Scaffold this motif. Structure first.
Motif, short mmCIF file in Angstrom:
data_model
loop_
_atom_site.label_atom_id
_atom_site.label_comp_id
_atom_site.label_asym_id
_atom_site.label_seq_id
_atom_site.Cartn_x
_atom_site.Cartn_y
_atom_site.Cartn_z
N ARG A 66 38.12 -34.22 12.46
CA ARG A 66 38.22 -34.54 11.05
C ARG A 66 39.64 -34.99 10.74
NH1 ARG A 66 34.32 -33.33 7.12
NH2 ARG A 66 32.42 -32.55 8.14
N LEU A 67 39.75 -35.79 9.69
CA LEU A 67 41.02 -36.35 9.24
C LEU A 67 41.61 -35.40 8.22
CD1 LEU A 67 42.94 -38.85 9.26
CD2 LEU A 67 41.64 -39.64 7.29
N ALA A 68 42.71 -34.76 8.58
CA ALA A 68 43.38 -33.80 7.69
C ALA A 68 44.06 -34.55 6.59
CB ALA A 68 44.40 -32.98 8.46
N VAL A 69 43.66 -34.26 5.36
CA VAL A 69 44.26 -34.88 4.19
C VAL A 69 44.41 -33.83 3.11
CG1 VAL A 69 43.26 -37.15 4.71
CG2 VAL A 69 42.02 -35.61 3.18
N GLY A 70 45.32 -34.07 2.18
CA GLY A 70 45.34 -33.31 0.92
C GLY A 70 44.02 -33.58 0.22
N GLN A 71 43.53 -32.60 -0.54
CA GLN A 71 42.28 -32.74 -1.29
C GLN A 71 42.43 -34.02 -2.08
OE1 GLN A 71 39.77 -31.59 -5.06
NE2 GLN A 71 41.67 -32.69 -4.63
N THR A 72 41.50 -34.95 -1.92
CA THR A 72 41.77 -36.32 -2.32
C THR A 72 41.70 -36.58 -3.82
OG1 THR A 72 39.48 -37.07 -1.89
CG2 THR A 72 41.07 -37.28 -0.10
N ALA A 73 40.90 -35.79 -4.54
CA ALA A 73 40.77 -35.96 -5.96
C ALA A 73 42.04 -35.55 -6.67
CB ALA A 73 39.58 -35.16 -6.49
N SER A 74 42.73 -34.51 -6.17
CA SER A 74 43.82 -33.92 -6.94
C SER A 74 45.18 -33.82 -6.25
CB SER A 74 43.44 -32.54 -7.46
OG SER A 74 42.30 -32.67 -8.29
N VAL A 75 45.20 -33.57 -4.95
CA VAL A 75 46.49 -33.36 -4.28
C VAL A 75 47.15 -34.73 -4.15
CG1 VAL A 75 47.65 -32.63 -2.13
CG2 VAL A 75 45.67 -31.32 -3.05
N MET A 134 49.52 -28.71 8.64
CA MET A 134 49.29 -27.55 9.52
C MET A 134 48.06 -27.71 10.40
SD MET A 134 50.26 -24.38 7.19
CE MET A 134 49.70 -24.93 5.62
N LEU A 135 46.99 -28.32 9.88
CA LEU A 135 45.81 -28.59 10.71
C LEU A 135 46.17 -29.45 11.91
CD1 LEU A 135 42.98 -29.36 8.14
CD2 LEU A 135 43.42 -27.27 9.44
N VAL A 136 47.00 -30.46 11.67
CA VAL A 136 47.36 -31.40 12.72
C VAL A 136 48.30 -30.69 13.68
CG1 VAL A 136 48.49 -33.60 13.26
CG2 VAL A 136 47.14 -33.36 11.13
N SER A 137 49.28 -29.97 13.14
CA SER A 137 50.19 -29.22 14.02
C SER A 137 49.44 -28.33 15.00
CB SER A 137 51.19 -28.39 13.22
OG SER A 137 51.94 -27.59 14.14
N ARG A 138 48.38 -27.69 14.52
CA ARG A 138 47.57 -26.82 15.36
C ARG A 138 46.57 -27.53 16.24
NH1 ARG A 138 49.82 -24.83 11.67
NH2 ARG A 138 50.24 -22.60 11.40
N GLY A 139 46.49 -28.85 16.12
CA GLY A 139 45.54 -29.66 16.87
C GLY A 139 44.11 -29.46 16.41
N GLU A 140 43.95 -28.86 15.24
CA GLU A 140 42.64 -28.63 14.64
C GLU A 140 42.11 -29.86 13.92
OE1 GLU A 140 42.95 -25.06 12.37
OE2 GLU A 140 43.69 -23.96 14.11
N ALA A 141 42.99 -30.82 13.69
CA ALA A 141 42.58 -32.15 13.26
C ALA A 141 43.34 -33.11 14.17
CB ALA A 141 42.92 -32.38 11.79
N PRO A 142 42.65 -34.11 14.73
CA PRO A 142 43.35 -34.98 15.69
C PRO A 142 44.26 -35.98 14.96
CG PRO A 142 41.11 -35.74 15.33
CD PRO A 142 41.20 -34.42 14.65
N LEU A 143 44.01 -36.17 13.67
CA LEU A 143 44.79 -37.05 12.83
C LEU A 143 44.90 -36.45 11.45
CD1 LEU A 143 43.38 -40.63 13.48
CD2 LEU A 143 45.64 -39.77 14.30
N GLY A 144 46.00 -36.77 10.78
CA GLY A 144 46.13 -36.41 9.39
C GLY A 144 46.94 -37.44 8.67
N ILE A 145 46.87 -37.38 7.35
CA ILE A 145 47.69 -38.25 6.53
C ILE A 145 48.59 -37.38 5.68
CG2 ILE A 145 47.79 -40.03 4.82
CD1 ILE A 145 44.91 -40.83 5.65
#
Ligand code: MOO
Length: 232
Positions: free
Chosen positions: A113-122, A156-167
């Motif tokens: 999954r793509l780690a992102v801030g909650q898209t509606a509000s963050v 943090m998700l990406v740092s932990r490798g729990e998401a292979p990509l993040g924005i």
């Protein structure tokens, strides 16, 4: 001395911590910073949380406070800018061109999954969704998001490798060597990333305006510059 209560966008963690310390060194007034998504902070303020200063990672959440009479336009101004980056875990070998149709999605692999801030509000989530839409990649990842409470929860998700990509923001990447920048989103793929700062109208702290004014001074600016923010 009652500390100046600063509510700061999550992405301001290290810089505002350093700034809080430097401000107290210079003035003797302690600064207590609370971090969360800008949305969370703005909502908390709107509901009466006793904050003196607010720094948002976008215009919208400052506008929100202004429209609710909690920020006067004269007491707000833009302080910082950032870039938007696609990050991966430091050890990842992914190479991704965010402009290439389906490249972000394919880079998620089978179940990533793509780690992102909650898209509606963050703010980082809304900048990310704007970038993804502008680049025609939203539909390919919109059901494959790991929406997170802030840009730093995403990081943090990406740092932990729990998401292979993040924005995240460029400054977030600098703040965490456990991730690496896979790409920088085109600056024109999203609204300019701008952090307004405001003294809150209801603040009773004698140092509130002093703190905000101080953020314009060289050593305060230098903190944010060292940490990879642009200066407004
Ligand atoms: O308000 Mo943030 O720094 O986009 O999580």
């Amino acid at each position: 001395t009652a500390p100046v209560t600063v509510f700061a966008a999550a992405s301001l963690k290290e810089s505002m911590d350093e700034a809080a310390t430097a401000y107290e060194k210079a003035t003797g007034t302690p600064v207590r910073v609370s971090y969360a998504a800008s949305s969370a902070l703005a909502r908390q303020i709107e509901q009466g949380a006793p904050a003196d200063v607010f720094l948002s990672a976008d215009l919208e959440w400052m506008d929100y406070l202004q429209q609710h009479g909690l920020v006067l336009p004269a007491q707000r101004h833009n302080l910082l800018g950032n870039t938007l980056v696609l990050v991966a875990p430091a050890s990842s070998k992914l190479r991704v061109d965010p402009r290439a149709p389906g490249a972000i999605a394919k880079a998620l692999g089978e179940n990533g999954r793509l780690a992102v801030g909650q898209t509606a509000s963050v703010p980082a989530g809304s900048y990310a969704a704007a970038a993804l839409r502008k680049l025609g990649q939203w539909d390919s990842v919109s059901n494959r998001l790991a929406e997170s409470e802030s840009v730093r929860a995403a990081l943090m998700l990406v740092s932990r490798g729990e998401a292979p990509l993040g924005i995240v923001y460029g400054s977030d990447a600098r703040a965490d060597a456990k991730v690496r920048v896979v790409a920088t989103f085109p600056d024109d793929s999203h609204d300019a990333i701008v952090y307004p700062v405001a003294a809150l109208k209801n603040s009773n702290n004698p140092a509130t305006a002093a703190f905000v004014s101080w953020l314009g001074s060289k050593p305060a600016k230098a903190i944010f510059a060292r940490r990879g923010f642009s200066l407004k």
